[PDB]
C-alpha cells in the first residue's frame, strides 16, 4: 500500500505468510535446482578477447640449423609478436642476394613468406615481383604440379590484401577444392583482411566468390570482424549479387547482425574518420542492412505508434 | 520433418525399397508429369485411405499400404497440400513422415498452387 512496493525478501509479512514459509516450519531446502547442469550456455563476452593475436600468423617451421645460420638476416624480419622497423628495400635486397646460396625449397620459401609479411606491414608495392621472379614459374604458371607451402600462400595473400592489388584473384582461385585446397586452413583474420581489401577496391564478384567460399568452408562468420564485412557489403551495387547478399545476410547471427547495422551506421557516420580511405555511398545496401537488423531482432509493441491513425468501422 | 531437393534427386537415381514417395496432387487436370517411383494418393482422400485395412487399401489405390515403420515422403505442388496430408499421415500413427517443400514446382519448374490463398489479409 503506497507507491513504493514492498520488497518481498526483507518483509516478514510476505515471507511468513501462508503463501510462503513461516518461521516455525522446518526451514530446510524445498527443491534442488540444477540450472547450469541441464542446459549450459557457451561463453561469449560482450567485450572482445584481450590476448588474441589479431593479425595473420605466418607459421614459421624452419629447421633449427638454417634458423641459426640465417639469424643475422632473419633478425631483421618479424619473429613472434615482434615487428622490427627495418626498411623493406634492405630485406628484399638481402633475400635477393643470399637466398640462391641455400639449398632447400622449404627454407627459401619460409624465408620468402617472412619477407612478404614484413613488406605487407609497411605497405611497400615493389614486393610482388618476388612472386613472379621465383615462385610464379613453379606454382601458378601453365599448370605446374608443385604445391606451395601454406605459409607462403597465406603471406602473399595477406600482402595483396594489405597493399590493394588485383593479383590476389589468381591466388585465391588456386586454393579451392580442385586446386591446392588451402581454403579450410585460413585464420578468421585472413578472411577479415580479404573481405576488407576486396570491398575497398570495389569488386562485387570477388566479394560473392569469397563469401560463398567462407560459407562452404565453415569459417567463423559472426567472429569475422564487422568492419571488413560492412566495407565488403558496401561495395555491392549489382542486382544479382544484391539478391545473393540478402539471402546470405540470413547466414549471420542476431547479435552480429545488430552490430553490422551499428558498424555500418557509424562508418558513414561519426566514425567516417576511422577509415584510411573514406567509404563510398551505397544507400540501398546500408538500408537493407538496417532492415535485416530490424527483422531478425525481437519486436517491441508500441500500440500508440502502430494504431495512431486507426478508426473503428461499423461495417 | 522436411526433405530437401538433394534428397529428392538422390532418391530418383538411387531409390530405397521401403522408401515410398507419394503424390498428394488433388486435380488430375494440373498433373502433367510423373515423379520417379511415386504413387498417387490424392490429399482429399487421405483421411479415408489410412482408415483402410491393407487389403481394402490395395483394392482401392492399386498399390500396397505402407507399413507404419516405413518412410513415407509426401509431395505436392507448393508443399501445402502435402503438409495437410502429412498431418493426416501423422494422426494415424506413422513413424517416418516427410514433406517436400515446394516439391513438384522445384522438380519440374511448374508454377502452380494446391490452393489459392494469398499473402494479403483483407483490411478488418
Amino acid at each position: 500500500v503506497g507507491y513504493t512496493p514492498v520488497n518481498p525478501d526483507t518483509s516478514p509479512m510476505v515471507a511468513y505468510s501462508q503463501y510462503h514459509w513461516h518461521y516455525n516450519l522446518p526451514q530446510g531446502m524445498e527443491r534442488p535446482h540444477s540450472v547450469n547442469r541441464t542446459f549450459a550456455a557457451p561463453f561469449q563476452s560482450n567485450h572482445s578477447l584481450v590476448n588474441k593475436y589479431r593479425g595473420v600468423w605466418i607459421e614459421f617451421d624452419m629447421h633449427p640449423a638454417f634458423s641459426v645460420a640465417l639469424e643475422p638476416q632473419l633478425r631483421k624480419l618479424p619473429r613472434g609478436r615482434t615487428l622490427p622497423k627495418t626498411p623493406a628495400e634492405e630485406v628484399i635486397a638481402d633475400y635477393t642476394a643470399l637466398a640462391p646460396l641455400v639449398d632447400d625449397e622449404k627454407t627459401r620459401d619460409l624465408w620468402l613468406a617472412k619477407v612478404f609479411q614484413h613488406c605487407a606491414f609497411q605497405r611497400c608495392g615493389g614486393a610482388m615481383e618476388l612472386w613472379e621472379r621465383y615462385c610464379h614459374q613453379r606454382f601458378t604458371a601453365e599448370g605446374a604440379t608443385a604445391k606451395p607451402p601454406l605459409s607462403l600462400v597465406k603471406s602473399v595473400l595477406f600482402y595483396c590484401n594489405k597493399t590493394d592489388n588485383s593479383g590476389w584473384r589468381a591466388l585465391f582461385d588456386r586454393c579451392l577444392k580442385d586446386g591446392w585446397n588451402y581454403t579450410p586452413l585460413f585464420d578468421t583474420a585472413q578472411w577479415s583482411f580479404m573481405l576488407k581489401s576486396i570491398g575497398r577496391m570495389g569488386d562485387e564478384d570477388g566479394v560473392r566468390a569469397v563469401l560463398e567460399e567462407m560459407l562452404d568452408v565453415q569459417a567463423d562468420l559472426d567472429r569475422v570482424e564487422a568492419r571488413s564485412v560492412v566495407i565488403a557489403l558496401n561495395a555491392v551495387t549489382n542486382a544479382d549479387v544484391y539478391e545473393f547478399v540478402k539471402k546470405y545476410l540470413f547466414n549471420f547471427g542476431e547479435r552480429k547482425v545488430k552490430f553490422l547495422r551499428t558498424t555500418y551506421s557509424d562508418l558513414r557516420g561519426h566514425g567516417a574518420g576511422k577509415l584510411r580511405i573514406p567509404l563510398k555511398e551505397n544507400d540501398n545496401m546500408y538500408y537493407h542492412v538496417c532492415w535485416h537488423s530490424s527483422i531478425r531482432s525481437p519486436r517491441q509493441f508500441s500500440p500508440r505508434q502502430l494504431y495512431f491513425d486507426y478508426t473503428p468501422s461499423t461495417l | 520433418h522436411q526433405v530437401y531437393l538433394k534428397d529428392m534427386l538422390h532418391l530418383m537415381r538411387y531409390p530405397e525399397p521401403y522408401t515410398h514417395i507419394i503424390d498428394c496432387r488433388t486435380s488430375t487436370q494440373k498433373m502433367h508429369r510423373w515423379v520417379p517411383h511415386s504413387l498417387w494418393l490424392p490429399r482429399d482422400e487421405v483421411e479415408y485411405a489410412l482408415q483402410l485395412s491393407a487389403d481394402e487399401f490395395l483394392d482401392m489405390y492399386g498399390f500396397r499400404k505402407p507399413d507404419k515403420s516405413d518412410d513415407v515422403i509426401l509431395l505436392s505442388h507448393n508443399g501445402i497440400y502435402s503438409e495437410q496430408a502429412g498431418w493426416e499421415w501423422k494422426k494415424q500413427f506413422f513413424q517416418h513422415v516427410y514433406n517436400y517443400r515446394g516439391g513438384t514446382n522445384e522438380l519440374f519448374g511448374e508454377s502452380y498452387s494446391d490452393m489459392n490463398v494469398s499473402d494479403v489479409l483483407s483490411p478488418w
Binding site: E243 | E106, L107
Partner: peptide, 21 residues
C-alpha cells in the same frame, strides 16, 4: 514485407539427370 528476394528461376531439376541416364 514479403517476398524478401527474387524466387528461383523456373529451372527444371529432374530433366538433366534423366537425360544423362
Amino acid at each position: 514485407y514479403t517476398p524478401i528476394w527474387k524466387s528461383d528461376p523456373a529451372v527444371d531439376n529432374v530433366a538433366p539427370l534423366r537425360d544423362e541416364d
